[PDB]
Amino acid sequence: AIRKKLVIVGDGACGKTCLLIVFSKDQFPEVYVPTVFENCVADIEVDGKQVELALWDTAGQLRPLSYPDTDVILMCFSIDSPDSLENIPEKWTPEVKHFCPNVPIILVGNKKDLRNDEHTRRELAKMKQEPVKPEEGRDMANRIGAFGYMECSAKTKDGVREVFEMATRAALQ
Ligand SMILES: Nc1nc2c(ncn2[C@@H]2O[C@H](COP(=O)(O)OP(=O)(O)O)[C@@H](O)[C@H]2O)c(=O)[nH]1
Ligand SMILES: [Mg+2]
Question: Second label for 110, Cα 20 to 30 Å away, from 13, 71, 120, 154?
Answer without folding.
Answer: 71
